[PDB]
Amino acid sequence: MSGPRPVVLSGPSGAGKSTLLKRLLQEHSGIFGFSVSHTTRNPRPGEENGKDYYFVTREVMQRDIAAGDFIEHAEFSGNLYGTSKVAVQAVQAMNRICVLDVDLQGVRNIKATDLRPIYISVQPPSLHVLEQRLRQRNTETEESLVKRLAAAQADMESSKEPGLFDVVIINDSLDQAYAELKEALSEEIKKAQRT
Amino acid sequence: SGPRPVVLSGPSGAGKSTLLKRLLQEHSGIFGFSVSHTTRNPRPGEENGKDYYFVTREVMQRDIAAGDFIEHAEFSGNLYGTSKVAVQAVQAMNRICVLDVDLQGVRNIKATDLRPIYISVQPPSLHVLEQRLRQRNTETEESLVKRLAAAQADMESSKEPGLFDVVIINDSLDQAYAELKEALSEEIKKAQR
Ligand SMILES: C[C@@]1(F)[C@H](O)[C@@H](COP(=O)(O)O)O[C@H]1n1cnc2c(=O)[nH]c(N)nc21
Ligand SMILES: C[C@@]1(F)[C@H](O)[C@@H](COP(=O)(O)O)O[C@H]1n1cnc2c(=O)[nH]c(N)nc21
Numbered sequence A: 001m002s003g004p005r006p007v008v009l010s011g012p013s014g015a016g017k018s019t020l021l022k023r024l025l026q027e028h029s030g031i032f033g034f035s036v037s038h039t040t041r042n043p044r045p046g047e048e049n050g051k052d053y054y055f056v057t058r059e060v061m062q063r064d065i066a067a068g069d070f071i072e073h074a075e076f077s078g079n080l081y082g083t084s085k086v087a088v089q090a091v092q093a094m095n096r097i098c099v100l101d102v103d104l105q106g107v108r109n110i111k112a113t114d115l116r117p118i119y120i121s122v123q124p125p126s127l128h129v130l131e132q133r134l135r136q137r138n139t140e141t142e143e144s145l146v147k148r149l150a151a152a153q154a155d156m157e158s159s160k161e162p163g164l165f166d167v168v169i170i171n172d173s174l175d176q177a178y179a180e181l182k183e184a185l186s187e188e189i190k191k192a193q194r195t
Numbered sequence B: 001s002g003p004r005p006v007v008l009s010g011p012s013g014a015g016k017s018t019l020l021k022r023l024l025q026e027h028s029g030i031f032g033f034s035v036s037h038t039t040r041n042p043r044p045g046e047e048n049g050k051d052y053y054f055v056t057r058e059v060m061q062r063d064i065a066a067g068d069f070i071e072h073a074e075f076s077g078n079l080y081g082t083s084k085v086a087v088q089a090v091q092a093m094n095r096i097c098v099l100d101v102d103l104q105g106v107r108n109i110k111a112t113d114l115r116p117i118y119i120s121v122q123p124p125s126l127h128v129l130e131q132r133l134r135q136r137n138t139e140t141e142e143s144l145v146k147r148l149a150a151a152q153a154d155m156e157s158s159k160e161p162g163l164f165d166v167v168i169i170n171d172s173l174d175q176a177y178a179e180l181k182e183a184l185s186e187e188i189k190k191a192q193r
Helices: A017-027 A058-066 A085-093 A104-111 A127-137 A142-158 A174-193 B016-026 B057-065 B084-092 B103-110 B126-135 B141-158 B173-192
Strands: A007-010 A070-076 A079-084 A097-101 A118-123 A167-170 B006-009 B069-075 B078-083 B096-100 B117-122 B166-169
Touching: A007 A017, A007 A104, A017 A097, A017 A174, A058 A070, A058 A079, A070 A085, A070 A104, A079 A085, A085 A097, A097 A174, A104 A142, A118 A174, A127 A142, A167 A174, B006 B016, B006 B103, B016 B096, B016 B117, B016 B173, B057 B069, B057 B078, B069 B084, B069 B103, B078 B084, B084 B096, B096 B173, B103 B117, B103 B141, B117 B141, B117 B173, B126 B141, B166 B173
Parallel strands: A007 A097, A007 A118, A118 A167, B006 B096, B006 B117, B117 B166
Antiparallel strands: A070 A079, B069 B078
């Protein structure tokens, strides 16, 4: 169980967490790791059990969740997905920082476990800016843009809760936000680099 | 060597561009996009080799004729295009280069020695494409009519044997996105290693 502390990275989808995470991985090859999640969906060609996912049934996933084996879980497109404590510890055993990129529900689920991650939220400067960035993409209809913005406002309002996040990064500019992210993780990166 | 590029096509606004954006956003270390060449003048903040490769019309025309480009088009009096080298540069990083192009682009890429996976993202019907375009695009009926005629030509061409490796019907974005991931699962496994 010795090794780098996991990082829970959250904030509204589209507000920057994904872009910052890609730069983090690109600039620090061999430092970060993703846990092998469990899923109830059928494996696709080329996917391997124990590497891409632990492919289990709904009955097994529910039994393991009830036993307290998971740090977080959620439903996506008719299938269950989740991160086991063992999968996180497996990344930690490789001297890697396990990145848990989750939504607010995921943050709250992980907060209810005995894991001690660093909690970071990446926020847009405003809901207006998030809306303009999402409108610039053309991935939304007015209705889907509205549903996304309502969920994003709930996330933004909850990000202000005292003690919820260790670091809240306001993404005014990607380079500035990335520098704050690297600074927040500098002590754990240094540990994963020199071991 | 490296992951095969993916050429995503289908009618404009039928889902291909939304799926490409989602693919890139949700994945880490797997997908990449190539840096295009352009003959337009660079603007403030633009950097050669990052935003575009900035070349003259004389050079771009010579290079297109030499077979250096996989696809190209004219826009506002300037040439834009994807070179084979820019795609191979993404492939060299063990990444899947995603190419979002129209039918003409698909046919141009078919004429190169690249071996991409060709995927068409289709609306369930022309009527459903029309209702989706009316909901979003703030357009005139005439402009909607011209777009629907181009879309029907694309839908008819998507049925051509051997043109597309996979034809995904975009009933709903999440369903179409799951099928896109299934179609690329073997190449994603290569990029994940
Ligand atoms: C990260 C995702 F949103 C993915 O985009 C989606 C679908 O994954 P796939 O079936 O592998 O295309 O499933 C979600 N997902 C994939 N793995 C997990 C997980 O461990 N926990 C949670 N809460 N969600 C997970
Ligand atoms: C995608 C665009 F329609 C752009 O919207 C337009 C103008 O680009 P810009 O001058 O940078 O706004 O040029 C087009 N364009 C920009 N790069 C390319 C390209 O590589 N291939 C094709 N076929 N078109 C390209």
